[PDB]
PDB file of N, CA, C and O in Angstrom:
ATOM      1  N   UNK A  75     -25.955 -31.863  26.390  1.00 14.20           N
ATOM      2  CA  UNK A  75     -25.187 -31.727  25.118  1.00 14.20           C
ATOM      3  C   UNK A  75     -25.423 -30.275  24.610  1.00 14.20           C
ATOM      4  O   UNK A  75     -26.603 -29.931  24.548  1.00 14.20           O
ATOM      5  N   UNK A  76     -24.541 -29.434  24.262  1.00 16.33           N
ATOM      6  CA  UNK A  76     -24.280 -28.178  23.500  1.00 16.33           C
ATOM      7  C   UNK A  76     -23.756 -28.011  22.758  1.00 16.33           C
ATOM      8  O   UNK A  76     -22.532 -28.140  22.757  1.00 16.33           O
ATOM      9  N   UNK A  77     -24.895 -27.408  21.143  1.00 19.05           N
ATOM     10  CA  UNK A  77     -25.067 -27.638  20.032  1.00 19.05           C
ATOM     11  C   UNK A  77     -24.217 -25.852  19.722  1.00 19.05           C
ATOM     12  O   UNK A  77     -24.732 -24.759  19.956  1.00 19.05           O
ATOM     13  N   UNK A  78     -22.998 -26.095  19.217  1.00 18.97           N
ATOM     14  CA  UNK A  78     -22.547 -24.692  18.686  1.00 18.97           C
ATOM     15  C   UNK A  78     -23.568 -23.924  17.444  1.00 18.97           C
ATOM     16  O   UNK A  78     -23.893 -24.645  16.500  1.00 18.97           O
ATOM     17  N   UNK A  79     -24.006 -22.637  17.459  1.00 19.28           N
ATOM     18  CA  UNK A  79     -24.675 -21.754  16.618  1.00 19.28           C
ATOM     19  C   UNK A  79     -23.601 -21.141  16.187  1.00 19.28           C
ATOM     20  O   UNK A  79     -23.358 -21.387  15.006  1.00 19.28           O
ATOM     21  N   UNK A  80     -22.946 -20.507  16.653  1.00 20.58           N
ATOM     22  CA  UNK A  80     -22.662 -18.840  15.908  1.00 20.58           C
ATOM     23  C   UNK A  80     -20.933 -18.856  17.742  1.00 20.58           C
ATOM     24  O   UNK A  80     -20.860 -19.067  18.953  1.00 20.58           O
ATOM     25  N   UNK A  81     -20.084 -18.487  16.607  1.00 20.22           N
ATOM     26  CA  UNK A  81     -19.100 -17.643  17.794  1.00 20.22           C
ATOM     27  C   UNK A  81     -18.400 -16.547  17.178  1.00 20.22           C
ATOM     28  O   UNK A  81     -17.794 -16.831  16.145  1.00 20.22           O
ATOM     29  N   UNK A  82     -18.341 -15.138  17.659  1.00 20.19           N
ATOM     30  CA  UNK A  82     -17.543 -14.224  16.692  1.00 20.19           C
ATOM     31  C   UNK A  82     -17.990 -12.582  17.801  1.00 20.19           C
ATOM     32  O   UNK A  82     -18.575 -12.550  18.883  1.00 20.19           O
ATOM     33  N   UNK A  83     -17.563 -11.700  17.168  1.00 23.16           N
ATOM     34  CA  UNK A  83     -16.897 -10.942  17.805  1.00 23.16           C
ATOM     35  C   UNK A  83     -18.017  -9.416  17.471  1.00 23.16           C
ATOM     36  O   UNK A  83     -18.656  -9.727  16.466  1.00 23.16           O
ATOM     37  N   UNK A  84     -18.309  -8.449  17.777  1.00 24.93           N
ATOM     38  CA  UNK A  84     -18.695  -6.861  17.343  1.00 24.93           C
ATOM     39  C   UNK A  84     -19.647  -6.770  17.696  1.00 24.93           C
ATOM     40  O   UNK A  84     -19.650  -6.990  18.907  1.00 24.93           O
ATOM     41  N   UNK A  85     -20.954  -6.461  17.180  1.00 26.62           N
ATOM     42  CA  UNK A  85     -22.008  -5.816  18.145  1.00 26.62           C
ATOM     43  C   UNK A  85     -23.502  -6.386  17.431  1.00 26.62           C
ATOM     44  O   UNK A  85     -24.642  -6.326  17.893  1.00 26.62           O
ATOM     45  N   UNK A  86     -22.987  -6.986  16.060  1.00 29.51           N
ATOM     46  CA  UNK A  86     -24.150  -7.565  15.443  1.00 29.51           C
ATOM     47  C   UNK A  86     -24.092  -8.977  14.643  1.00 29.51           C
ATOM     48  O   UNK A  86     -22.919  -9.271  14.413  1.00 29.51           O
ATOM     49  N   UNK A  87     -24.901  -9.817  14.212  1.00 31.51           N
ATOM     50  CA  UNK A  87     -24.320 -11.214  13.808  1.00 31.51           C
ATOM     51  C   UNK A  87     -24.472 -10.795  11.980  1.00 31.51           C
ATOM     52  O   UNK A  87     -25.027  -9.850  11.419  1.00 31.51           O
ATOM     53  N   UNK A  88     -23.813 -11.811  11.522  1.00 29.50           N
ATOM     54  CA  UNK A  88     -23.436 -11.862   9.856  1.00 29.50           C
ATOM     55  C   UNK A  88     -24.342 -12.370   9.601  1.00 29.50           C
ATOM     56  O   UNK A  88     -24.857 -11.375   9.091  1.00 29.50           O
ATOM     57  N   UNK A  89     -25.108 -13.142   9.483  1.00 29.03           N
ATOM     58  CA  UNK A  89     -26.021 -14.036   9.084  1.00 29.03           C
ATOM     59  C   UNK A  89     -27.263 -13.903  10.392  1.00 29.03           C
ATOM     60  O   UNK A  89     -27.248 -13.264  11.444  1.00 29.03           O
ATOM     61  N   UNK A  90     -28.561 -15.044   9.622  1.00 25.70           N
ATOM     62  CA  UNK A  90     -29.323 -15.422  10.214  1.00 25.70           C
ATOM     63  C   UNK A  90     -29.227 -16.917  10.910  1.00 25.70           C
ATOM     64  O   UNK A  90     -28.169 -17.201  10.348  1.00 25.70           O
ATOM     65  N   UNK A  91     -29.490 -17.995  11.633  1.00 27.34           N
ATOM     66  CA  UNK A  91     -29.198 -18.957  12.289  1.00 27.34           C
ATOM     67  C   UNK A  91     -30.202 -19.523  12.577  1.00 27.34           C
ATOM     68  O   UNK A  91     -31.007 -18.811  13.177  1.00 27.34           O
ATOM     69  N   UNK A  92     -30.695 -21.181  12.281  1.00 27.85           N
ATOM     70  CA  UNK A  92     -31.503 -21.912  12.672  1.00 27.85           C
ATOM     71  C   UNK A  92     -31.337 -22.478  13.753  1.00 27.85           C
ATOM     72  O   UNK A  92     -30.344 -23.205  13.797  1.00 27.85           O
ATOM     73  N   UNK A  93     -32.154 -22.391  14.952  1.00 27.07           N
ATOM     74  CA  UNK A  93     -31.833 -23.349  16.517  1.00 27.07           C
ATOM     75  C   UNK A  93     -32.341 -24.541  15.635  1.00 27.07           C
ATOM     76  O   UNK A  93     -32.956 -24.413  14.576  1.00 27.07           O
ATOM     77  N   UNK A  94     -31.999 -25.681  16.217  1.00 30.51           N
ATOM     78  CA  UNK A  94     -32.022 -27.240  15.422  1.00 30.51           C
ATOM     79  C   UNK A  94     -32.958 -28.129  16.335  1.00 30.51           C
ATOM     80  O   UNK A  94     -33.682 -29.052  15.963  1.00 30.51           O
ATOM     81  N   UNK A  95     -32.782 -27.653  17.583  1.00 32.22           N
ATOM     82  CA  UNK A  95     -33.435 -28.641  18.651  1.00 32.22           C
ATOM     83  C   UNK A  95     -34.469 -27.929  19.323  1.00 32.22           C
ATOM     84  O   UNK A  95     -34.687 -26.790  18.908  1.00 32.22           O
ATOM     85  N   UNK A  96     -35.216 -28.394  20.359  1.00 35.19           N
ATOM     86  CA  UNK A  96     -36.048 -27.973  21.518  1.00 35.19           C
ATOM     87  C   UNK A  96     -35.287 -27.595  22.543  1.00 35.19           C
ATOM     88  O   UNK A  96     -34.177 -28.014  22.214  1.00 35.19           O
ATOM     89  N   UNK A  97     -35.210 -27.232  23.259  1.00 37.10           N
ATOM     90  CA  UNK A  97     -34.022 -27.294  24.321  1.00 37.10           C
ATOM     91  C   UNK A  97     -33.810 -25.497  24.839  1.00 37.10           C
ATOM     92  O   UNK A  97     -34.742 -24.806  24.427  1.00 37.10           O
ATOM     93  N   UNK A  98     -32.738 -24.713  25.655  1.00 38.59           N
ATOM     94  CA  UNK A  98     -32.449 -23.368  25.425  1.00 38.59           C
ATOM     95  C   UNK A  98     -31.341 -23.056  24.785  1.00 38.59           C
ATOM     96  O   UNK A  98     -30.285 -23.689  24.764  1.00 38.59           O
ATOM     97  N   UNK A  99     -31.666 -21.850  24.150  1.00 37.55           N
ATOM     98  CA  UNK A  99     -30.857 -20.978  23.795  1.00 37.55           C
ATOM     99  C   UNK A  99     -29.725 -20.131  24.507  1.00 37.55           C
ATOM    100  O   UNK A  99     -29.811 -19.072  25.127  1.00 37.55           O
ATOM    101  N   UNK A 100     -28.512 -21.029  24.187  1.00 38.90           N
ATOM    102  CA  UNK A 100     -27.912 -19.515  25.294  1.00 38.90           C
ATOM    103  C   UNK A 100     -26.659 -18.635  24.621  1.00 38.90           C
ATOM    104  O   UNK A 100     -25.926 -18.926  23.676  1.00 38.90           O
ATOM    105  N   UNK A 101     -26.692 -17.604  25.357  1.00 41.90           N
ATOM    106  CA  UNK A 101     -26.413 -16.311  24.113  1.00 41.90           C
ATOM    107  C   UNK A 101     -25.093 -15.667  24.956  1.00 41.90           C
ATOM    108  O   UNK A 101     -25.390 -14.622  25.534  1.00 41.90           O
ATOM    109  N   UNK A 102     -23.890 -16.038  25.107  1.00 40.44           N
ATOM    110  CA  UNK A 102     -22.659 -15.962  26.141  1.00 40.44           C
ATOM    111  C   UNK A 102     -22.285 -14.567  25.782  1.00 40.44           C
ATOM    112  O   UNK A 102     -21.380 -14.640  24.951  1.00 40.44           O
ATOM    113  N   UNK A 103     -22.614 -13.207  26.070  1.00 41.61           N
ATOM    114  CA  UNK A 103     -21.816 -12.166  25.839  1.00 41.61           C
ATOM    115  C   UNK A 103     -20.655 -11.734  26.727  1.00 41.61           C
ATOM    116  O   UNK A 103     -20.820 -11.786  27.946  1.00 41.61           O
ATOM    117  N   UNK A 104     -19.512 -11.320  26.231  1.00 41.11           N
ATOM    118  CA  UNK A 104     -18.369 -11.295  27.305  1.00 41.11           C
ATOM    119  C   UNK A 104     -17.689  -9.832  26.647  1.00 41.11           C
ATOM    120  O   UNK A 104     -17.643  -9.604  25.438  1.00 41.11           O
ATOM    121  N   UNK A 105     -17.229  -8.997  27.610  1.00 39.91           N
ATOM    122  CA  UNK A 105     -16.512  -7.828  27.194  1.00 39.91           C
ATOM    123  C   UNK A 105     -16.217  -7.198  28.706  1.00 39.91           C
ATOM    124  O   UNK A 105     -16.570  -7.936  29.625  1.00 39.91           O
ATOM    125  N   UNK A 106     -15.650  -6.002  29.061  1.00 41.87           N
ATOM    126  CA  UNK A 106     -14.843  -5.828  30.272  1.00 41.87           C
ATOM    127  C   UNK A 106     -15.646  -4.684  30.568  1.00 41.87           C
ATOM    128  O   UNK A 106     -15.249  -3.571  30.915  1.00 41.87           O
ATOM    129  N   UNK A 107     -16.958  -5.124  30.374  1.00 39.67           N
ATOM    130  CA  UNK A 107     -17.737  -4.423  31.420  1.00 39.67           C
ATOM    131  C   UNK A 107     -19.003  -5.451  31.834  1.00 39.67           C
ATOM    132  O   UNK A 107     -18.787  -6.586  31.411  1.00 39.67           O
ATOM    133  N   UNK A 108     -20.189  -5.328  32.515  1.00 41.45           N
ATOM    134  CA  UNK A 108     -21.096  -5.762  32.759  1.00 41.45           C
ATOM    135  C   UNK A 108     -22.672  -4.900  33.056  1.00 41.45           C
ATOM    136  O   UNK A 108     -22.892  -3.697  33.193  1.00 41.45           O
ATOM    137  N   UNK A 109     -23.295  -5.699  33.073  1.00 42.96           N
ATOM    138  CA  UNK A 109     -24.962  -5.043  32.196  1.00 42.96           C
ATOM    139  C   UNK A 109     -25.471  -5.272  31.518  1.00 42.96           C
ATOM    140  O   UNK A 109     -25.079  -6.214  30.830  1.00 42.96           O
ATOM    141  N   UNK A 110     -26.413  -4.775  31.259  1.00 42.65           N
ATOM    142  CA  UNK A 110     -27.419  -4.397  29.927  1.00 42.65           C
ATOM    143  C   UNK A 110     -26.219  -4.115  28.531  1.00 42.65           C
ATOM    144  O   UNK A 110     -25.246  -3.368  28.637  1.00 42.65           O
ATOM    145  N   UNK A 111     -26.567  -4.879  27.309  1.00 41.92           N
ATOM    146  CA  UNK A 111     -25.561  -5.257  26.742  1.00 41.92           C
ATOM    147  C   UNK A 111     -26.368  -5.149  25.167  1.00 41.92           C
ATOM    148  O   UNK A 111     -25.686  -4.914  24.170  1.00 41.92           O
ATOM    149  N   UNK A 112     -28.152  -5.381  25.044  1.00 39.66           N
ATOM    150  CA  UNK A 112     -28.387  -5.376  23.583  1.00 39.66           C
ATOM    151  C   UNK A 112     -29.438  -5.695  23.393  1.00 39.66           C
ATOM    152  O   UNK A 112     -30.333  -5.253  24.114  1.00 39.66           O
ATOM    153  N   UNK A 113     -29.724  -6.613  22.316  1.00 38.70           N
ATOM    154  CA  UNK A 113     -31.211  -6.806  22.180  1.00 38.70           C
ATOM    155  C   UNK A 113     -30.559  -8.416  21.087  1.00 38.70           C
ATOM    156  O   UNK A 113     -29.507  -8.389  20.448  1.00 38.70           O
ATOM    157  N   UNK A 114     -31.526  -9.660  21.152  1.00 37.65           N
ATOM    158  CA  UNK A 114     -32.004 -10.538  20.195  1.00 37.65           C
ATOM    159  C   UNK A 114     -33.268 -10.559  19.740  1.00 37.65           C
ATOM    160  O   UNK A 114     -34.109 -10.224  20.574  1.00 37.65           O
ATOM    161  N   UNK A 115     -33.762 -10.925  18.396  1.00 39.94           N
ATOM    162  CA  UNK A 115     -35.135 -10.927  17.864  1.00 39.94           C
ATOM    163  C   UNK A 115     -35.025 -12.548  17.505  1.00 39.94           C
ATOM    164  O   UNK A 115     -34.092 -13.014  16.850  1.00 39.94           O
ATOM    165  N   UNK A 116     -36.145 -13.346  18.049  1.00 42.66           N
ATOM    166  CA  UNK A 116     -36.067 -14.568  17.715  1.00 42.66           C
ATOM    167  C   UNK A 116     -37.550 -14.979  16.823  1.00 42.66           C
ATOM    168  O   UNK A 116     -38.678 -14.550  17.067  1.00 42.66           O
ATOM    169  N   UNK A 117     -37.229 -15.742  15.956  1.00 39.68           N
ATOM    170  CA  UNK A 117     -38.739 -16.035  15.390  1.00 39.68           C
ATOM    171  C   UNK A 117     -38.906 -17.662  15.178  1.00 39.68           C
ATOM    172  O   UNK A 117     -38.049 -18.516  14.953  1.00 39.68           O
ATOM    173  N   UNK A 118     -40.366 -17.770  15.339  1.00 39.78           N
ATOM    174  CA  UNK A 118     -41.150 -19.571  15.324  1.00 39.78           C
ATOM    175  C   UNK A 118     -42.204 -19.248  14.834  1.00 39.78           C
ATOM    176  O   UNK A 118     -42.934 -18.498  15.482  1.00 39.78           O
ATOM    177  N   UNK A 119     -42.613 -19.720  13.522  1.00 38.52           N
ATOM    178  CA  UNK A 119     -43.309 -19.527  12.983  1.00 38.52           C
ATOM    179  C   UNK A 119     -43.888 -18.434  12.969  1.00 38.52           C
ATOM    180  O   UNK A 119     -43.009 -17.684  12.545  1.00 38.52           O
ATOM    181  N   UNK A 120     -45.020 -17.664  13.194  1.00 37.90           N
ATOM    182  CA  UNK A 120     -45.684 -16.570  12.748  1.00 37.90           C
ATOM    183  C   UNK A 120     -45.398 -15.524  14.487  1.00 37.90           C
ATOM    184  O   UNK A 120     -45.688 -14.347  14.701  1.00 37.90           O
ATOM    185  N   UNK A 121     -44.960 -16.213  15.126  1.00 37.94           N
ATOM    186  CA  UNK A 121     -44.235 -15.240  16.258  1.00 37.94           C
ATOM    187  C   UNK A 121     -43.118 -14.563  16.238  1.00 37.94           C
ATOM    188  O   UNK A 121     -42.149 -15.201  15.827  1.00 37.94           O
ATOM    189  N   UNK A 122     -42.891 -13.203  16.624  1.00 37.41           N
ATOM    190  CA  UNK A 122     -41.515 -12.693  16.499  1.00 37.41           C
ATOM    191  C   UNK A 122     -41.333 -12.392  17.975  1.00 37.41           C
ATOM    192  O   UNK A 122     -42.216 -11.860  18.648  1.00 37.41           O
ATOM    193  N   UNK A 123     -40.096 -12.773  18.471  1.00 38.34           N
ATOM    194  CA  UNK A 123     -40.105 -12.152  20.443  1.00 38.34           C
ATOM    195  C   UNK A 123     -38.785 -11.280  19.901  1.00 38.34           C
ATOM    196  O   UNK A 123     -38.079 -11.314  18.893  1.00 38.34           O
ATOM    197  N   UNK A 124     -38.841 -10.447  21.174  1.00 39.03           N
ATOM    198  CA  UNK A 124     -37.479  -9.675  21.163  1.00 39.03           C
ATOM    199  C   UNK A 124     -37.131  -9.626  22.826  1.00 39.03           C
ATOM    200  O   UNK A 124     -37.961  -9.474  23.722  1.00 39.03           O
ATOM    201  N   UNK A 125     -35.644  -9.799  22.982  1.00 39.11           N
ATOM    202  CA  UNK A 125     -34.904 -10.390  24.076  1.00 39.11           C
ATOM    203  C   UNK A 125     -34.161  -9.204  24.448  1.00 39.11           C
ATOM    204  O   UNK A 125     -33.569  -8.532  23.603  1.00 39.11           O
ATOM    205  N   UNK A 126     -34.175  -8.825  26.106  1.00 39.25           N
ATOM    206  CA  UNK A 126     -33.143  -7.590  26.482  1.00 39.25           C
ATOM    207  C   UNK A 126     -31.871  -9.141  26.437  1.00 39.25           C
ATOM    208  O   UNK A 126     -32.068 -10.337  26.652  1.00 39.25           O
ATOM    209  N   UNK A 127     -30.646  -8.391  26.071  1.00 39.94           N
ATOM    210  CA  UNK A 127     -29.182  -9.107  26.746  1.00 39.94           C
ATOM    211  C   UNK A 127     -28.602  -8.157  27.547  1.00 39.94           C
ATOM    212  O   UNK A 127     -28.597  -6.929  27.461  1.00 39.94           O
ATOM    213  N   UNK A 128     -27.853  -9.317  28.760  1.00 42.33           N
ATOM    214  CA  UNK A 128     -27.389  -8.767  29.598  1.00 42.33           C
ATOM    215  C   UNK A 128     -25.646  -9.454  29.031  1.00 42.33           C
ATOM    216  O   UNK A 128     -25.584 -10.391  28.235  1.00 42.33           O
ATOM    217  N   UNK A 129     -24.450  -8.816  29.583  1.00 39.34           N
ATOM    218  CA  UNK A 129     -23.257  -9.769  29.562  1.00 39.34           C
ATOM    219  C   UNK A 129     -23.419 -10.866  30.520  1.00 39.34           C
ATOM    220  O   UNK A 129     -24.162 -10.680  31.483  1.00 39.34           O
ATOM    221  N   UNK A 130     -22.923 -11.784  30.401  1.00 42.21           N
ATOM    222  CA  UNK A 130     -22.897 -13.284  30.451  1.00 42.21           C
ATOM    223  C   UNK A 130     -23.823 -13.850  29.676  1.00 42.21           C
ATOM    224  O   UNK A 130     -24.158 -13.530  28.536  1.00 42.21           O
ATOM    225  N   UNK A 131     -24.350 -14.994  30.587  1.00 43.14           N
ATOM    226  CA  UNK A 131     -25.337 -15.908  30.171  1.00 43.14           C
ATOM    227  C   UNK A 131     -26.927 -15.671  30.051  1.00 43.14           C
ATOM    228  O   UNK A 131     -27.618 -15.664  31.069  1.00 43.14           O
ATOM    229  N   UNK A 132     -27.483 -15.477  28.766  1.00 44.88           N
ATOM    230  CA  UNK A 132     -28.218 -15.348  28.649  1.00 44.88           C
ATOM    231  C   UNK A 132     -29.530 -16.217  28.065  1.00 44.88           C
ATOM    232  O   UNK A 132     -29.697 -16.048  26.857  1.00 44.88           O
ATOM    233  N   UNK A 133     -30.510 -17.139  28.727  1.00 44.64           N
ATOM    234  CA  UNK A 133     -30.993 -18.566  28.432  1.00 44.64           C
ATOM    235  C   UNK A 133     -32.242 -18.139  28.045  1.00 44.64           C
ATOM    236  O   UNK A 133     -32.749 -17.384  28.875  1.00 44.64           O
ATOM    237  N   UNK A 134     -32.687 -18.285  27.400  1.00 46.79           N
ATOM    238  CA  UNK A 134     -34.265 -18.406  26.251  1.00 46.79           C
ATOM    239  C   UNK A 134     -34.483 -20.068  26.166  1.00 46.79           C
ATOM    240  O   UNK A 134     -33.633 -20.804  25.665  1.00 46.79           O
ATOM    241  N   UNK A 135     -35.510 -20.460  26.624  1.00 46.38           N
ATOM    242  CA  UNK A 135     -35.803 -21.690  26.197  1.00 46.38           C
ATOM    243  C   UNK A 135     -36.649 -21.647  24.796  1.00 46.38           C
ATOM    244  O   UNK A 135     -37.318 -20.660  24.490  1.00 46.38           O
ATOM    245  N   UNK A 136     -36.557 -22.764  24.012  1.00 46.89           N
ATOM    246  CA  UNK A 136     -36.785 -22.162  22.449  1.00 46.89           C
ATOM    247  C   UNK A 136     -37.116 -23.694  21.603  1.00 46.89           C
ATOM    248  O   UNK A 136     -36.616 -24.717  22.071  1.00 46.89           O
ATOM    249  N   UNK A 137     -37.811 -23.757  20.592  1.00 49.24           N
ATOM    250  CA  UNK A 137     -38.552 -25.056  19.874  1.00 49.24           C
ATOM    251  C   UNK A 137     -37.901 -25.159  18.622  1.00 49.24           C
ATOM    252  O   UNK A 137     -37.944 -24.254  17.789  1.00 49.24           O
ATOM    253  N   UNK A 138     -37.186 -26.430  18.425  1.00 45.62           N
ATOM    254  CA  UNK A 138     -36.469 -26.664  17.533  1.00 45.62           C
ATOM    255  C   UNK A 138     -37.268 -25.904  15.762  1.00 45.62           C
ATOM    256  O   UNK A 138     -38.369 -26.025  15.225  1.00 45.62           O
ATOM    257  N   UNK A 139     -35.957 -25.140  15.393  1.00 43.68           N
ATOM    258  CA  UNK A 139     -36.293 -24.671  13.837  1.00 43.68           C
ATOM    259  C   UNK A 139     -36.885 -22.900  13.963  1.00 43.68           C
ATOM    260  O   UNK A 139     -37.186 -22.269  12.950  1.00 43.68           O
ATOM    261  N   UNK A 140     -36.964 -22.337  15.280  1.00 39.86           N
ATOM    262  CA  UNK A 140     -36.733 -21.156  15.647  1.00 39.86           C
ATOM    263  C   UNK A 140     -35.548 -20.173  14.832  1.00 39.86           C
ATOM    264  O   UNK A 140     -34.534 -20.843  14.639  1.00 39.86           O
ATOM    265  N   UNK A 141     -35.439 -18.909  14.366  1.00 42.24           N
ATOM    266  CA  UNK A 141     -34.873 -18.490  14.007  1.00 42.24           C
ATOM    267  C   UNK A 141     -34.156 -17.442  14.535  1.00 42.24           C
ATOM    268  O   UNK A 141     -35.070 -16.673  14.831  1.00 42.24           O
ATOM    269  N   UNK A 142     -32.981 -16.813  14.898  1.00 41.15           N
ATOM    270  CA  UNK A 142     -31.896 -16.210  15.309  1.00 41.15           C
ATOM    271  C   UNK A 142     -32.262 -14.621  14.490  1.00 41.15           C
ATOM    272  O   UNK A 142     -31.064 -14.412  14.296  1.00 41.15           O
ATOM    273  N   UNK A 143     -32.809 -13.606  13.989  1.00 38.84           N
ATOM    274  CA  UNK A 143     -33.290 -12.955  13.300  1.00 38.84           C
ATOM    275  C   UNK A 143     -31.917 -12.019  12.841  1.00 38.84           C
ATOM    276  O   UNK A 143     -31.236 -11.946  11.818  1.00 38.84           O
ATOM    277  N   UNK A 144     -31.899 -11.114  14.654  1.00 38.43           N
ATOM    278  CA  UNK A 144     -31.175  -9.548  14.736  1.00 38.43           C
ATOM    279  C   UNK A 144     -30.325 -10.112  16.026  1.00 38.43           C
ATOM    280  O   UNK A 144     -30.695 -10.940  16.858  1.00 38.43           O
ATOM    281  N   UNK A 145     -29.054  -9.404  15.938  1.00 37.33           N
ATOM    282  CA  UNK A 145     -29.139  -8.993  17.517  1.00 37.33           C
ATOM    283  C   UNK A 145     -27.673  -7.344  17.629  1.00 37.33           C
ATOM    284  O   UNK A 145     -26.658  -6.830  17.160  1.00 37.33           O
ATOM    285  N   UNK A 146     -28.357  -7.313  18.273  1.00 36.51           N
ATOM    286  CA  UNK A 146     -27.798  -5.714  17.890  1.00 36.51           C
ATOM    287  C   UNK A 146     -26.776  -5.222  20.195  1.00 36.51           C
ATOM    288  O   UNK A 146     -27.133  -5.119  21.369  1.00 36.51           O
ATOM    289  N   UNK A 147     -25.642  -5.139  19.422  1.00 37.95           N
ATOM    290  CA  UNK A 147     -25.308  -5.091  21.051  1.00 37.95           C
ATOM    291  C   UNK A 147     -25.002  -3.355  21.006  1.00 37.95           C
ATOM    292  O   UNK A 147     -25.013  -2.604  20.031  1.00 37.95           O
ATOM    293  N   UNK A 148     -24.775  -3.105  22.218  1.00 37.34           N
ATOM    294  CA  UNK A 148     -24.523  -1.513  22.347  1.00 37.34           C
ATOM    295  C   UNK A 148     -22.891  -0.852  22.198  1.00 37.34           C
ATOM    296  O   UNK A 148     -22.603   0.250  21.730  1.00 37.34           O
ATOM    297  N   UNK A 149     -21.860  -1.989  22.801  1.00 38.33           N
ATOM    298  CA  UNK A 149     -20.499  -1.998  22.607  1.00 38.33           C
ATOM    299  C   UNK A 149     -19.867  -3.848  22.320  1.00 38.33           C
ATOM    300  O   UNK A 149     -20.270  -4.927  22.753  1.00 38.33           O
ATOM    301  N   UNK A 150     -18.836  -3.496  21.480  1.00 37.79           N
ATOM    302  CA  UNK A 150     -17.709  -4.661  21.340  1.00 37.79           C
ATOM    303  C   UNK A 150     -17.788  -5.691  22.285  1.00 37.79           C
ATOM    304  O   UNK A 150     -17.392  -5.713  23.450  1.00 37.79           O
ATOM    305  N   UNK A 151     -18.603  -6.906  21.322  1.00 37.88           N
ATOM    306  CA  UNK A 151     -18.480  -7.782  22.606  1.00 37.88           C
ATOM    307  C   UNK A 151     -17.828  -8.966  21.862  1.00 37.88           C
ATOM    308  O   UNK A 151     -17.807  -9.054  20.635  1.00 37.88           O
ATOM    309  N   UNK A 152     -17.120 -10.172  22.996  1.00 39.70           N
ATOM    310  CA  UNK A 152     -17.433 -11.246  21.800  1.00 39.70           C
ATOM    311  C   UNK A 152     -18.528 -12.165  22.303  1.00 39.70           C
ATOM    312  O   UNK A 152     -18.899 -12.055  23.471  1.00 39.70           O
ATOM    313  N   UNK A 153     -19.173 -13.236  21.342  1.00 38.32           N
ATOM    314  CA  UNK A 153     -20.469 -13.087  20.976  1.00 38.32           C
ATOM    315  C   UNK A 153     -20.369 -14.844  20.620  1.00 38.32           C
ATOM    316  O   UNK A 153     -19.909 -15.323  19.583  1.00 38.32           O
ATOM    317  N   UNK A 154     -20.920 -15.584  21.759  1.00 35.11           N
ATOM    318  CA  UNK A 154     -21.106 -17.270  21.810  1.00 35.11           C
ATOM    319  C   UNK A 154     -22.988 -18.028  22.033  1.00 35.11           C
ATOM    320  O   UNK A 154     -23.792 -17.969  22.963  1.00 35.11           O
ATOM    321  N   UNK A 155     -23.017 -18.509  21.010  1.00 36.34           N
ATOM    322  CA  UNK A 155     -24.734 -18.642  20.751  1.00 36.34           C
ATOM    323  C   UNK A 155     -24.329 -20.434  20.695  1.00 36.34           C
ATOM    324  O   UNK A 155     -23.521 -20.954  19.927  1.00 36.34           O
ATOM    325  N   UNK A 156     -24.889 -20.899  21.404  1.00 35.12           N
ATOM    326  CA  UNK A 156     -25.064 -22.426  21.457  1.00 35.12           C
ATOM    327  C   UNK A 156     -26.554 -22.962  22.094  1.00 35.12           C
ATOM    328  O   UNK A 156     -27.169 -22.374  22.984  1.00 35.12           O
ATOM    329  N   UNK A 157     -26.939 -24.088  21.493  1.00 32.02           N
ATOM    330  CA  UNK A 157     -28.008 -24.929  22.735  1.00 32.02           C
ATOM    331  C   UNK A 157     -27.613 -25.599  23.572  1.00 32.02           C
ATOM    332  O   UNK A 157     -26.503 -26.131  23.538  1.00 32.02           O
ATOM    333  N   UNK A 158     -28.397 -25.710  24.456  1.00 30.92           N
ATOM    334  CA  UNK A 158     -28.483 -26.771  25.858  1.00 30.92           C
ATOM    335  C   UNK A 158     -29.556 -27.605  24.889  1.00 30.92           C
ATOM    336  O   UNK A 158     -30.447 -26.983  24.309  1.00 30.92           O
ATOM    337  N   UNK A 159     -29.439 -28.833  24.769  1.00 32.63           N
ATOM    338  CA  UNK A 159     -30.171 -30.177  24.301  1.00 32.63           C
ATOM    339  C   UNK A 159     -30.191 -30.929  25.085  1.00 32.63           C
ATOM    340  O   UNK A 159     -30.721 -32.021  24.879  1.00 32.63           O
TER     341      UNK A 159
END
């Protein structure tokens, strides 16, 4: 089952975002190139990680109530954040 977060378009998100479940994170970047694509900052409690993105699929496994912080891309992408549950 895949839990929609966040879908939208540019190089950074509007908001911050709660993951809801245990399960992974996956972070779909798509644009008409391929690579190295950005960075996510995720936080759980008193931990902060920070994530290279590549375009496509990008899977973080992650503990429900985790937080979505930053994510900062380098060019125009559009931009699909859902869980695997």
């Amino acid at each position: 089952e895949n839990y929609l977060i966040y879908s939208g378009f540019g190089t950074s998100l509007p908001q911050t975002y709660t993951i809801p479940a245990n399960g992974y994170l996956i972070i779909s970047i798509t644009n008409t190139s391929t690579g190295n694509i950005g960075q996510i900052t995720l936080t759980i409690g008193s931990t902060t990680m920070t994530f290279n993105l590549q375009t496509g699929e990008n899977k973080i496994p992650v503990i429900a109530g985790t937080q979505i912080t930053n994510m900062t891309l380098t060019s125009s992408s559009a931009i699909l954040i859902y869980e695997e549950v």
